[PDB]
Write an enzyme that holds these catalytic residues in place. Structure first.
Site, PDB file in Angstrom:
ATOM      1  CB  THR H   1     -22.855  14.391  -7.209  1.00 55.92           C
ATOM      2  OG1 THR H   1     -22.838  13.588  -6.027  1.00 55.92           O
ATOM      3  CG2 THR H   1     -21.998  15.609  -6.967  1.00 55.92           C
ATOM      4  CB  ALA H  49     -18.478  12.349   0.187  1.00 54.25           C
TER       5      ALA H  49
END
Lengths: 210, 207, 227, 214, 236, 298, 196, 200
Positions: H1, H49
């Site tokens: 990420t 997430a």
């Protein structure tokens, strides 16, 4: 029924006048006589709620002191959760929703709302609240409000001439010769709340008498 | 109307002046705290009520006076202790409050039973209050008052409100609250000092 | 003219022997008292008009708005007290956001009206929910007994029964929105004998393509000068 | 304040009880009559201990007394668990009269039909208090409740003199119950409790008969 | 004039041994419009007559979904009908969650009458001023249970409650022997004919004010709207 | 001003005083209020606050030049009488309440009835409404002045019945509330051409003005029903049965028949065992089995 | 770790703090004020864990601002120190303690200037000079060397800069910029940032 | 990420990659990691997430209720403070959040890094994620407050590309948003394999 008993002390409590200007907003209340031997410090009716908001009242001085110290927490519990100061409509909606029976006071919540906008509100004891350009609450409120309807348009050129030929001139419609019977408050945009001492309160009346 | 306690503010102290009322002869003259109830190190009070509801109102003021001191390690200012009880009475007895704090100096208050207080220079609560409130308004130099001049005013207005022929020298409970050497002193004055003020009044008012 | 009480009038949780609850109806009868609000459902939207009743010229008109925004696709109009209904607008606003958070949808106008009515002392306000949903534009009345119903047009307020008799004559199911804005302001000129301006009415329409839109002081002037 | 005035009618209908604070002691004398010979005289007790040094007697309603004698024993041991000293008699009455006030305050509950006389001993100084059904409490030198207590308090005021010893106070307490007895008091018809430096104890009936020979 | 003393609360017996406040709440099912329920050993049918507040308004949700195999019919306060309907829906979901089977229609009605009896015995609260006709289909066949504000309940061959239902109970008691052998479309005609006799001679069963609820053997419960009752009102 | 004009008394053997007169002054007030019949509305807040003070503080409560200040007050006085209205409206409603509750000499019954028939003729429905609420607390506090002048009770009976035909629903239901009280206090006897005027008004065809014409008979039958709340006279069961026949009428009629019958059953459960004997057994089955329930039972 | 320092003189309570806030190996903000003003004449320098600083110091800032509104007069610096110590102490036995190391500093019109110290366990100590962080280990002995009790406020800025140059020479973390402000009798001024 | 945001003169850019990982397995590469809160705010999904897509959907709920009540849009300084106060109540329970509330308000461009550990700081430039350290040096050398809009697009678009090139847990496609004064706009969703042809 129960809200009607709240309003009867607003009509007998001391007068509270507020106008709203382009740059400053002004409260002014009728400082009554106390007694011969009563220290007149604890009987002041212009209370500050936060750094950008203050209010007058008229009614029961017992139930006012509940309303003020509950609104002073919501001015600070706002800053914990939001970090922004209260809008003047937020603390007015808080006081109105705070008002079993409503707390028998009518207030003139004034101030600025983080964008520099001047504000002037009124919590009637019914639980209702709405905006105002200039307003009056108290014992002679109907005639003072009729006086302020006559004078609003070309007064906001100078913030001094706006806020004595309206506010002290609206108390002088109902209250005495002045100087020791007017408690007057004024706050600029994001400066402080300043209560004018009677050395300067009698200064502005002399311009009005002229 | 039961008590006859009265406060007088001066330039160098405040004073409560309560009268000890004894109805029956077989009531025990208590040697405990009788009429002037000390709240903390710099503040005292007196109630216009029975000595059972006194012990509820004073031991609630002493919770507020020590929950403050536990929290800030400073003695409570002598208006916030008045205000915090007036918030409790807002949700049935009248009081006086003498005390000192660093903000507004020597202070005197009077809590209504409704929950309203006010700063007074001199006032009365209880039996024949308006008879002696009016007598204080006659003779009180509101600012030019020494402590002994305030103390002579107390036993003056108590000789015209309570009893017969002696001003009840063993039944009047003047306490004065002064500043001395930085700390704060609360002197419930003794019976020899309370008797001489009756002697210094009966000599000065007869002559 | 005269007062004719009965003995079964002063008990809340008490049935009258005909099976009535007269401490419910007499509260509900005491609610048709405020400024008249009229909502009209059309096939191109739904209008919502209300009288305002301002006393002083110093009072700002933009702060006694008796028509609010529930979500971006649902409007609402009140009658009663503006503070009596503040706890019904709060649930209607939150439940549309609980429904959005949980289901990623816009809640239908019937379901907001159903969820508000589930709170039912009865209420002191009656409401008109105007909104555009998957069924098109709709209008729901929300009587203070917690009874809700779909309405083609419904006037609430003081002179409601009397404006409702005028709505029955002027409504049809092929009506445009620009008619119903003007057809309701005809009726607000009937139910109060004053001249219309930007200070005595508020009007707001919810079209399919647009969000909820409160009319401004220019858009209120351009409609009154027609009628 | 209506029920509180009516609970005092239940006190003033109750049996006489007399308390006298002597120089070195306190005496609590009361009336324990039985309606029949069928009642066991020694089964229940009116003079009743709280601590080793505090006892209390009543005038008024019997069962309402036992609620207050069960709370006054708790409040004396809740003091002793915390401070590890026997409770002051002044501090016990403040807590008992707060309990009696607590039932006047709350609704749906009648007040107690009981006045109390609470003796005690602290720091070498005797104590005698009286708690009313209102929650008020007063320190006394000598008082009385029950039937003919107006005549009792005037009888005590003529025969009180603060230099009297404890043995002289047991006589002037039985002489106060003698005036409003209406019968012939044996060792069983009265109950006496004395409180001195040695502590509180109610007198055994053979000890009372020595005082009844006067 | 005649001030009764024994009808303030619901907890006061009269000297006749007759609680007035429960009998006054049973008169509140005579305040709603008439509804008819009936069964045939195939499909169980609720037929209802609806009222509107005005023109330019919908009439009412008069028949409500409870589960796939149970539907009710309101007569009385809708404020208390919505309160009972959320109880009956959740109880059907709890049996569907735990046992993974439809709740038996005899057993849910027992759960209502246990809930309904509680306000008829404790102070302050009032009885549920609503009477339900409950159409169901269990393993033992169909069911037309009736509940009352007095909390007893009634298994019925057929029952009509509401205003002017005594003229409809007169109809159903005359033709109840023929009901057990009807078809679906024949049974609903008997429900519409029973609902017809609750009307004046100057009113008609329009499709706008007639709602029909049907549950059956392989048919889940489904109500029929303002236009779906037209195949049932046409053949009449 | 109530003490400037206190000497103008009109006492029975008197003389017109030198002190200033009410008729010489009020004629000048109408000359300044002539654009109303902005600076005239400012003058009303002094006239209304004067007529509030001269209610019981004067020796003649109604000089005839003041009586035509009433039609200017009816169009200003609101209907709901709430605290949200203006001070001109709120002081005009409670000025009409003090004049209607004041007496009048029996030579004023042609003079005030000329005004109220003129004000409720056709001006605006606020004025038609408040004339009715003027009348109901003015032919009651003067109830035997009007019943002596028998020409006046024909003019009240005309005006109340002719204002059931109002174009505004809120007016005509107050005309039926007024009529129901006048029948109740026996100010208006229930004659036969009253009921013929309603029974030949209910049976009115509705092709789709005719709706408001048919409704006014249902107000008129309902006004007679609500007029005797605690007795059932001989005429009573007849004008409940054909009153009940308008239950499946359209909706302005349908509320009124549901208000009248639900208010009938409310007041007539006191001793209904004595009321049901004035009904036939065939008529008890109509009144018992009938829908007058509100919206929250459907 | 983040750095705090205070130097009390006869009439001033000179405090400084770094302007760096760091995640793992990077540092995210180059101008991060760690000083919170509570009255016109007191501050509160708060460091510690991520999150607990801005949740505790904002809690103490508004509850002391609430004292000014209810009363008109502000708290004394001693009472604001004991109020801060009271809340931090009785929450460390709760389920949600705070791991904040504080350095409170105010001026009083009567008692004079005052510097206060407390750790994350809330042990309040009034000190003539105090410091926090790992950089306190270097800079206390410059202060133990050159601090007189009567040091001028211009000789205290140069005493402060000797401590911060020690962090530039000897301390391993990059603490380039510092916020510096003085608390004399006229309130809280703001001296120029000492940067390297 | 890897996420990225920087305030410049014409607003604030938000950049992010698209790859969500399962330890070593790539679950998908089409992850919308810039969480569109409402038309005036937007946060990034760095860390867990679910723990960003829940607490900013709950922020979007709460920022909307502010708008309906108070008849004005929430400021960015307050919409981040709501998010910081929501996640501090679950401190030490394992929320792997970390985000950047961006937007415009009356105070100008707003940018506030909010982490699950309780941090909430304003600032000109931020970059969050496992490849946050690689997006810094490309962005720190090419940052100015006075850029152009086309330069500030390519600065953040490339700084995510260099981040995906070194971080194994960063990949997929870049997603570049621009937050101007009348709301935010999506300007590009350029694939990283298609960026490799242009930059090299």
């Amino acid at each position: 029924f129960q809200v009607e008993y709240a309003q009867e002390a607003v009509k007998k409590g001391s007068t509270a006048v507020g106008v709203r200007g382009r740059d400053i907003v002004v409260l002014g209340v009728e400082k009554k006589s106390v007694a011969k031997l009563q220290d007149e410090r604890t009987v002041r009716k212009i209370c500050a709620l936060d750094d950008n908001v203050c209010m007058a009242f008229a009614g029961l001085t017992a139930d006012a002191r509940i309303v003020i110290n509950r609104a002073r927490v919501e001015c600070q519990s706002h800053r914990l959760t939001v970090e922004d100061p209260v809008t003047v409509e937020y603390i007015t909606r808080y006081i109105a929703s705070l008002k079993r029976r409503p707390f028998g006071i009518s207030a003139l919540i004034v101030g600025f709302d983080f964008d520099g906008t001047p504000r002037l509100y009124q919590t009637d004891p019914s639980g209702t609240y709405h905006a105002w350009k200039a307003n009056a609450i108290g014992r002679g409120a109907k005639s003072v409000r009729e006086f302020l309807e006559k004078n609003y348009t070309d007064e906001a050129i100078e913030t001094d001439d706006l806020t004595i030929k309206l506010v002290i001139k609206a108390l002088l419609e109902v209250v005495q010769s002045g100087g020791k019977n007017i408690e007057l408050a004024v706050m600029r945009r994001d400066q402080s709340l300043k209560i004018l001492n009677p050395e300067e309160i009698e200064k502005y009346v002399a311009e009005i008498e002229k | 109307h039961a008590g006859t306690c009265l406060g007088i503010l001066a330039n160098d102290g405040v004073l409560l002046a309560a009268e000890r009322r004894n109805i029956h002869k077989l009531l025990d003259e208590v040697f405990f705290s009788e009429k002037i109830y000390k709240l903390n190190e710099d503040m005292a009070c007196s109630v216009a009520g029975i000595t059972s509801d006194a012990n509820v109102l004073t031991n609630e003021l002493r919770l507020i006076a020590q929950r403050y001191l536990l929290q800030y390690q400073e003695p409570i200012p002598c208006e916030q202790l008045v205000t915090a009880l007036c918030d409790i009475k807002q949700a049935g007895v009248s009081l006086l409050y003498i005390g000192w704090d660093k903000h507004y100096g020597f202070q005197l208050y009077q809590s209504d039973p409704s929950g309203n207080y006010g700063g007074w220079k001199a006032t009365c609560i209880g039996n024949n209050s308006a008879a002696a409130v009016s007598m204080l308004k006659q003779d009180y130099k509101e600012g030019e008052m020494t402590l002994k001049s305030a103390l002579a005013l107390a036993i003056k207005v108590l000789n015209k409100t309570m009893d017969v022929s002696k001003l009840s020298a063993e039944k009047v409970e003047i306490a004065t609250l002064t500043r001395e050497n930085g700390k704060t002193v609360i002197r419930v004055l003794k019976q020899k000092e309370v008797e001489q003020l009756i002697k210094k009044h009966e000599e000065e008012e007869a002559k | 003219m005269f007062l004719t009480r009965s003995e079964y009038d002063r008990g809340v949780n008490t049935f009258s022997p005909e099976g009535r609850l007269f401490q419910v109806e007499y509260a509900i009868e005491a609610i048709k008292l405020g400024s008249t609000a009229i909502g009209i459902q059309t096939s191109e939207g739904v209008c919502l008009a209300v009288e305002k009743r301002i006393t002083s010229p110093l009072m700002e008109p933009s702060s006694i708005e008796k028509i609010v925004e529930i979500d971006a696709h649902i409007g609402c109009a009140m009658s009663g007290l503006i503070a009596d209904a503040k706890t019904l607008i709060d649930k209607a606003r939150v439940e549309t956001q609980n429904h959005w958070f949980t289901y990623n949808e816009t809640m239908t106008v019937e379901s907001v009206t159903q969820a508000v009515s589930n709170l039912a002392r009865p209420f002191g306000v009656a409401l008109l929910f105007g909104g555009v949903d998957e069924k098109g534009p709709q209008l729901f009345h929300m009587d203070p007994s917690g009874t809700f119903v779909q309405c083609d047009a419904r006037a609430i307020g003081s002179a409601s029964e009397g404006a409702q008799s005028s709505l029955q004559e002027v409504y049809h199911k092929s009506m445009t929105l620009k008619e119903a804005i003007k057809s309701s302001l005809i009726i607000l000129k009937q139910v109060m004998e004053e001249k219309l301006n930007a200070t005595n009415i508020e009007l707001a329409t919810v079209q399919p393509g647009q969000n909820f839109h409160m009319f401004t002081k220019e858009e209120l002037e351009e409609v009154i000068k027609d009628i | 304040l209506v029920q509180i005035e009516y609970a005092l009618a239940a006190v003033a209908g109750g049996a006489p009880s007399v308390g006298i604070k002597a120089a070195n002691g306190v005496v609590l004398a009361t009336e324990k009559k039985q309606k029949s010979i069928l009642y066991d005289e020694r089964s229940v007790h009116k003079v009743e201990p709280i601590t080793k040094h505090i006892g209390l007697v009543y005038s008024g309603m019997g069962p309402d007394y036992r609620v207050l004698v069960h709370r006054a024993r708790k409040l004396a041991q809740q003091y002793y668990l915390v401070y590890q000293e026997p409770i002051p008699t002044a501090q016990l009455v403040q807590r008992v009269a707060s309990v009696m006030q607590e039932y006047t305050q709350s609704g749906g509950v009648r007040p107690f039909g009981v006045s109390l006389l609470i003796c005690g001993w602290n720091e070498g100084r005797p104590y005698l208090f009286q708690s009313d059904p209102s929650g008020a409490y007063f320190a006394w030198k000598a008082t009385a409740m029950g039937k003919n207590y107006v005549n009792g308090k005037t009888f005590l005021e003529k025969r009180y003199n603060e230099d009297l010893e404890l043995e002289d106070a047991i006589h002037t307490a039985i002489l106060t119950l003698k005036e409003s007895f209406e019968g012939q008091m044996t060792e069983d018809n009265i109950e006496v409790g004395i409180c001195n430096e040695a502590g509180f104890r109610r007198l055994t009936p053979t000890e009372v008969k020595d005082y009844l020979a006067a | 004039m005649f001030r009764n003393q024994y009808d303030n609360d619901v907890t006061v017996w009269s000297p006749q041994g007759r609680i007035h406040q429960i009998e006054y709440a049973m008169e509140a099912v005579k305040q709603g419009s008439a509804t008819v329920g009936l069964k045939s050993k195939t499909h169980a049918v609720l037929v209802a007559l609806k009222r509107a507040q005005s023109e330019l308004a919908a009439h009412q949700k008069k028949i409500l979904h409870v589960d796939n195999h149970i539907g009710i019919s309101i007569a009385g306060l809708t404020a208390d009908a919505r309160l009972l309907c959320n109880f009956m829906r959740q109880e059907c979901l709890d049996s569907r969650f735990v046992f993974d089977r439809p709740l038996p229609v005899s057993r849910l009605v027992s759960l209502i009458g246990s809930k309904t009896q509680i306000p008829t015995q404790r102070y302050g609260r009032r009885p549920y001023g609503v009477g339900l006709l409950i159409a169901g289909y269990d393993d033992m066949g169909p069911h037309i249970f009736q509940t009352c504000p007095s909390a007893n309940y009634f298994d019925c061959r057929a029952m009509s409650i509401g205003a002017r239902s005594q003229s409809a109970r007169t109809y159903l008691e005359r033709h109840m022997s023929e009901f057990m052998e009807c078809n679906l479309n024949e049974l609903v005609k008997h429900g519409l004919r029973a609902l017809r006799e609750t009307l004046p001679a100057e009113q008609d069963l329009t499709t706008k004010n007639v709602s029909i609820g049907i549950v059956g053997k392989d048919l889940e419960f489904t109500i029929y709207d303002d236009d779906d009752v037209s195949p049932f009102l046409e053949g009449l | 001003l109530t003490y400037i004009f206190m000497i103008d008394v009109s006492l029975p053997n008197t003389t017109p005083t030198i002190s200033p007169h009410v008729p010489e002054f009020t004629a000048r007030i109408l000359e300044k209020l002539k654009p109303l019949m902005t600076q005239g509305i400012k003058l009303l807040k002094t006239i209304l606050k004067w007529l509030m003070a001269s209610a019981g503080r004067s020796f003649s409560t109604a000089v005839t030049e003041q009586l035509q200040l009433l039609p200017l007050f009816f169009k200003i006085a609101p209907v709901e009488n709430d605290n949200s209205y203006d001070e001109l409206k709120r002081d005009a409603k409670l000025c009409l309440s003090l004049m209607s509750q004041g007496l009048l000499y029996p030579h004023q019954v042609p003079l005030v009835l000329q005004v109220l028939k003129q004000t409720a003729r056709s001006s605006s429905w606020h004025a038609r409404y408040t004339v009715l609420t003027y009348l109901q607390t003015m032919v009651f506090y003067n109830l035997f002045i009007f019943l002596n002048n028998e020409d006046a009770v024909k003019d009240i009976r005309w005006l109340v019945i002719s204002l059931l035909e109002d174009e505004q629903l809120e007016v005509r239901e107050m005309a039926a509330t007024t009529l129901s009280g006048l029948l109740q206090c026996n100010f208006l006897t229930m004659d036969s051409p009253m009921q013929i005027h309603f029974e030949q008004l209910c049976k009115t065809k509705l092709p789709k003005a005719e709706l408001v014409k048919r409704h006014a008979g249902v107000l008129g039958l309902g006004a007679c029903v609500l007029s005797s709340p605690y007795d059932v006279p001989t005429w009573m069961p007849q004008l409940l049965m054909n009153l009940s026949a308008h239950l499946n009428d359209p909706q302005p009629i349908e509320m009124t028949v549901k208000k009248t019958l639900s208010n009938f059953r409310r007041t007539h459960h006191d001793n209904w065992q004595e009321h049901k004997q004035q009904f036939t057994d065939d008529q008890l089955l109509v009144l018992t089995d009938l829908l007058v329930s509100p919206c929250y039972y459907a | 770790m983040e750095y705090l320092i205070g130097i009390q003189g006869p009439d001033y309570v000179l405090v400084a703090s770094d302007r760096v806030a760091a995640s793992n190996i990077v540092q995210m903000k180059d101008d991060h004020d760690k000083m919170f003003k509570m009255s016109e004449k007191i501050l509160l320098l708060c460091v510690g864990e991520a999150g607990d600083t801005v949740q505790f110091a904002e809690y103490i800032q508004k509850n002391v601002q609430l004292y000014k509104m209810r009363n008109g007069y502000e708290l004394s610096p001693t009472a604001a120190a004991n109020f801060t110590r009271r809340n931090l102490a009785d929450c460390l036995r709760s389920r949600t303690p705070y791991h904040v190391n504080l350095l409170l500093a105010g001026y009083d019109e009567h008692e004079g200037p005052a510097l206060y110290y407390m750790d994350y366990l809330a042990a309040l100590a009034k000190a003539p000079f105090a410091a926090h962080g790992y950089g306190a280990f270097l800079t206390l002995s410059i202060l133990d060397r050159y601090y007189t009790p009567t040091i001028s406020r211009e000789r205290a800025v140069e005493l402060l800069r000797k401590c911060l140059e020690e962090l530039q020479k000897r301390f391993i973390l990059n603490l380039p910029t510092f916020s510096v402000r003085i608390i004399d009798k006229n309130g809280i001024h703001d001296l120029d940032n000492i940067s390297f | 990420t890897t996420t990225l945001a920087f305030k410049f003169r014409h607003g604030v850019i938000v950049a992010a990659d698209s790859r969500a990982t399962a330890g070593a397995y790539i679950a998908s590469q089409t992850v919308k990691k810039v969480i569109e809160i409402n038309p005036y705010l937007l946060g990034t999904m760095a860390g867990g997430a679910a723990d960003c897509s829940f607490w900013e959907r709950l922020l979007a709920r709460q920022c909307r209720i502010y708008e309906l009540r108070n008849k004005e849009r929430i400021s960015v300084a307050a919409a981040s403070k709501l998010l910081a106060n929501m996640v501090y109540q679950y401190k030490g329970m394992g929320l792997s959040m970390g985000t950047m509330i961006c937007g415009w308000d009356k105070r100008g461009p707003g940018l506030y890094y909010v982490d699950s550990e309780g941090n909430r700081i304003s600032g000109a430039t931020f970059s969050v994620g496992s490849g946050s350290v690689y997006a810094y040096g490309v962005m720190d050398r090419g940052y100015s407050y006075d850029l152009e809009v086309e330069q500030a697009y390519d600065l953040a678009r490339r700084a995510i590309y260099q981040a995906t090139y070194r971080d194994a847990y960063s990949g997929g496609a870049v997603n570049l948003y621009h937050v101007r004064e009348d709301g935010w706009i999506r300007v590009s969703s350029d694939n990283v394999a298609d960026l490799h042809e242009k930059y090299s």
